[PDB]
């Protein structure tokens, strides 16, 4: 049978940041991945 191959899903990692001058609680952005994969 014929199996499709896909390279491992991956992407860049980005950081939300209000700024140290305001707070330090931040939020992460994962690029171009379905969330169900972390």
């Amino acid at each position: 049978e014929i199996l499709d191959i896909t390279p491992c899903s991956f992407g860049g990692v980005s950081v939300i940041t209000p700024g140290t001058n305001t707070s330090n609680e931040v939020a992460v952005l994962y690029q171009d991945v379905n969330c169900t994969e972390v």
Partner: peptide
């Protein structure tokens, strides 16, 4: 009218359904 290996493709910030506004 207009038509893998670490090469990411970032989406544009503005979406057409905004540009069309």
């Amino acid at each position: 009218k207009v038509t893998f290996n670490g090469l990411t493709v970032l989406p544009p910030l503005l979406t057409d359904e905004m540009i069309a506004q």
